[PDB]
Design a protein around this ligand. Structure first.
Ligand SMILES: C[S@+](CC[C@H](N)C(=O)[O-])C[C@H]1O[C@@H](n2cnc3c(N)ncnc32)[C@H](O)[C@@H]1O
Ligand SMILES: C[S@+](CC[C@H](N)C(=O)[O-])C[C@H]1O[C@@H](n2cnc3c(N)ncnc32)[C@H](O)[C@@H]1O
Lengths: 236, 240
């Protein structure tokens, strides 16, 4: 007989829906080490809450983060005691040092609006790679793969609350419109919440072209733990 | 924001929810039909009062030659006709309807009577239904009782994923006296988009003493069946 309980914002939500930043980071680290057994320096770009980095730190002596939103740069530092974090734009940063690996996960690069912007980002990351360094990038769905009008839904049971969520994803051009609507029922009442988020899709040929332009040989791992696959490139 | 219950949106999703939690209108109607035959072996004409979508009536029709329905919300009576092409269905109020005809049995199931607000209204309903009974006719009524655990408040949640639509529901019910305040909030996502609609309803309990008095006031000898397939038991009365 025993019981568990946790207590005390996007990350909590995806964790409740079943996402494991730890398993993802571990798998990513295994693959980085496959290509680069001596990897020691890692930079996570668009780290957000730094959940991935929490696990990367257990695997690489030195790890760093790059983040544009200072509200998230706050939370990451809090959860990441010994981690050097930099405020910056992925499209523009320069830190004067190389890394054995640069990661860009959970569709972070798809927060850029144009192919010209994504290619500048991919080139920046590649610039911070030492020779043979590994670039890892989790892309947002490929236009060919993107179901349109896709409707998702999940029911999460939290402490004191039941949460319903229905989503709908639509496209206009290359831009993807995810409409999320939550229902939160608890002691005080039922609250409704609605969100929309926009990610700009790129094609496999577009990523592959951006890698090559920045001197990296790319490969794509179908599926992976998220469903969106994984690019693993090396800077030749 | 809030609408009244049993509108068109509610009618579309109303059965999906209770079936997903394990309700079988078929088994209920079948059991009800068996008991009607116990008390009235020759029963042939049946009327379901507050039939809603007619889910019960669907199985009653396979068991009784002539079957009819009475329903106030036209959105529920619409789907009722849809599901029951050749069945005379009537728009009416439980408290006042008059169809000029008697039946061998009149049913009022799934706490339909407890959507009335006062004891006087239930007694008018119970008296109206009894007027539509032939001598020896059977009245069967599923009353609302408070679940053993529902002391103050309850929060429910449901997600059914169908092919072509997903339906989410968060509910909240609070109790005070004999009144339960039902707040339901739905999310339907489908080909066309994401729709939300919200409802509030009042369910009012009546006492065993009140039912027994309403039946007697209406010329009926009553009896109560413990438990039943829902948990709320079942009143079965006969028209002397
Ligand atoms: C959901 S993604 C973060 C993915 C993160 N690795 C995770 O899994 O939690 C959003 C983050 O990307 C960062 N980001 C977006 N555009 C950026 C840009 N141009 N330069 C740097 N960071 C950027 C923002 O700061 C934001 O915190
Ligand atoms: C949701 S339950 C439906 C019961 C139905 N037999 C079933 O199990 O599906 C309550 C129903 O009572 C009906 N109703 C409520 N008050 C009524 C009244 N005064 N007269 C007739 N029908 C009424 C509503 O239209 C609603 O469909």
């Amino acid at each position: 007989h025993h019981e568990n309980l946790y207590f005390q914002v996007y990350e909590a939500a995806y964790r409740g829906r079943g996402k494991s930043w730890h398993d993802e980071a571990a798998d990513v680290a295994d693959r980085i080490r496959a290509a680069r057994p001596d990897a020691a320096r890692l930079l996570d770009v668009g780290c957000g809450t730094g959940a991935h980095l929490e696990t990367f730190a257990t695997r690489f002596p030195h790890v760093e983060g790059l983040e544009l939103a200072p509200a998230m740069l706050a939370l990451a530092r809090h959860r990441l005691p010994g981690v050097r974090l930099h405020a910056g734009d992925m499209r523009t940063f320069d830190l004067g040092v190389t890394f054995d690996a640069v990661t860009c996960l959970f569709t972070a690069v798809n927060f850029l609006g144009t192919v010209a912007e994504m290619r500048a980002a991919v080139a920046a990351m590649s610039a911070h790679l030492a020779p043979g360094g590994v670039l890892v990038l989790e892309p947002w769905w490929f236009p060919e793969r993107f179901i349109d009008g896709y409707v998702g839904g999940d029911l999460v049971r939290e402490e004191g609350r039941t949460v319903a969520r229905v989503s709908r994803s639509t496209r206009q051009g290359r831009v993807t419109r995810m409409e999320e609507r939550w229902l939160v029922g608890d002691a005080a009442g039922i609250r409704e919440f609605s969100q929309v988020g926009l990610l700009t899709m790129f094609t496999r040929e577009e990523y592959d072209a951006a890698f090559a332009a920045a001197g990296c040989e790319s490969a794509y791992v179908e599926g992976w733990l998220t469903g969106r696959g994984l690019f693993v490139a090396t800077r030749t």
